[PDB]
Amino acid sequence: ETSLVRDLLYVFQGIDGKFVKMCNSENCYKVDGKVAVSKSLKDITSKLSELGWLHNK
């Protein structure tokens, strides 16, 4: 929860935060590598990617 709030701050300032995201093009998509978690983090972190890909351009 709060670690994902901190993780978006670092891509908002620049390039990847807690984990590696390996995409500087077409959006900076976040990969957590977890499947047992809810499927509702992948769409929020998809919105955090268009703010981070627009930032580094």
Binding site: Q13, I15, G17, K18
Partner: protein, 91 residues
Amino acid sequence: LPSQETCLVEDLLYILIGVDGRYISVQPLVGRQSRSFSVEQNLDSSVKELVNRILPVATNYSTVTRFVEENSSFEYGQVNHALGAAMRTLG
């Protein structure tokens, strides 16, 4: 984590004063006049990289406080000696 960020921020503020810190070490390039500052590895690599955008500021601050140190060391009477005093005032 954020306390480890905060002491790195305080180390960064000493580096911009123009003085050597604790965890941020100074590496000489041409005689440590163009200072390539190097911080250690952090458990969060991103906040370390945000500091990496800020070490060129003290690098360039070290170039101009030593530019105005150099022109007065040979007691130049020229107009560059008066240009550097504005740089001392801006410093």
